[PDB]
Amino acid sequence: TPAFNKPKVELHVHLSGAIKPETILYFGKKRGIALPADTVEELRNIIGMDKPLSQPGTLAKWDYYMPVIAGCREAIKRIAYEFVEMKAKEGVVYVEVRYSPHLLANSKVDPMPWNQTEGDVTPDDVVDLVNQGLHEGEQAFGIKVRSILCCMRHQPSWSLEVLELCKKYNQKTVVAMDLIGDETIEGSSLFPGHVEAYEGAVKNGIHRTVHAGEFGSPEVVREAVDILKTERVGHGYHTIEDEALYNRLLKENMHFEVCPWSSYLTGAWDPKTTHAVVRFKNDKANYSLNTDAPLEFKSTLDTDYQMTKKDMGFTEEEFKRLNINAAKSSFLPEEEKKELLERLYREYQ
Template sequence: MSELIDPALPKVELHLHLEGAASPAFIRGLAKEKGLDISGIFAEDGGYDYRDFWHFLEVYEAATSTLQSPEDFRRLVLAVLEDRAEDGVIYAETFVSPDFCGGGDLGAWREYLHAIEEAAEQAQNTMGITLKGVVTCIRHFGPEKARPIALCAAETKGDFITGFGIAGDEKMHHPKDFAWAFDCAREAGLRLTAHAGEWGGAQSVRDALDHLRPERIGHGVQAIDDLALVDRLAEDGIVLEVCPGSNVFLGVYPSFRDHPVDRLREREVKITLSTDDPPFFRTTLVQEYETLARTFGWTEADFRSINADALKAAFCDEATKRSLLDRLTR
């Protein structure tokens, strides 16, 4: 079957969980080094194994338990960025959580962050890919645990840490419970995004907009069930970080054909395309583009337009955007 879209097309990816981008082989290797038995999280074919979204969260955290030091995260960043570069990604933002990097302690977080930044700089020099970090609190850990995470983000805002967000189980707690954390990050000058509308319905998107006031929404696809909300997203320029393969793999939608990404675009909502946790969902960004092209008839011009919108919505400085725009439009 011939390719519809050039795999080398330059891409921007804004919704990527760092630990969730770790390949099974990478995690198995760390587990072996540390003498950890996490064999129960793998399927017979070697991939990650889970039943549903909530079991996925458990498997995700089990895999993350192998990442125990700044050096582990340095190696992880290099491995993840090598995979992204193979997909043609020239700019990526990754969700990172001090919960998994020092347990929310600011001093420990600084050590982990130094290792992550060091790897990102190395990858930029050797692979030509730029990475920025979005500190993320974990919703199902609760609003009290989100506060020190927001403080970690505020204290380390800079060239690398440019954003703040929330991820995890949308069915636990209300967005208003995390208003303090978002206000803290906002006051520090961080750009804001929030997971919503993946599992919590259209109302979860509305609640996130009303109480957290982000400029981007992670997923957000269930907004399609409330057309007044869809119009609000379009009119207010709220950008959706859409991950179609993730949504289909987890059963949010039964197929790509049923996924609302095309309808959202038709109603002039700005969307970006990402893989979320690619090895968990057995996907790559090249595969996502190819499937979307076959399903909706999108052309290279469509993907170039989506990537241009993603670059405009990126949480990086204008000089970085200008240099990347040259590469996107070649």
């Protein structure tokens, strides 16, 4: 029985963490690329996670299946299309989906990811093919989807390029820029490539989210807000370790993109402690609930709502309040945001 059988808004989910295992198998076979299993079940057992690992152990799953997907025009469009299909099944009326265009390319990307042979699919092609699948998906399945392009903490040399892509494909599907990767890298938030990309974002009306405070380091959250000028924080559980910063961000109405089930499996949240989202709820903070990587976490949006309802005593009206906040904090042009908001109001009546 679904925890929240009403319209939801999702703001934090990775496209490459939300591929169908049967679709991976299909393209592995078609392209003659090796995979450690030949069935959905076995592939799920390998890439899926039943128990907490860690940041690196989570990220390690991508190497199994990304060679099958990256560099194939047909595959890139299809996962985007199928992303919409499966999200539509989760009672989501509006999704923002994020990815690194560089990680799906096999051309004009230095260094080359996934041990790929140099081909002809550029980062620009990737964004184009994803736009195509998300746009076709939106028409076919009746829900609204927009994209977010990701900078990588360890590759600031790609960030200005991520900004250029955001600018070229503004509103045709891209609404924002993200920053992913290892937040424990000393001063990665300050690398000139990220700093200037995020400065250029402000200048160009490209919206801004940043992964920070997922595993620790409240200072990285402060860096995201004060230096990169982010509008939402991805995760941000460890912001509560600096009470003065958490207090300020509460007053400034900062949005926290919360991924409860993810935080457990990545080991970001120690299960013996109470989840940060409990403080967010009690403080009436601005936050959303999100799947993050449903493939690795074997989850749907209901996983994360079930979790909060059962273990953390979340109510119908808290689920309603946070989805309204997620809408208000969405990266839509004002008029589309009003529409989304008005739809939520009537269905929560």
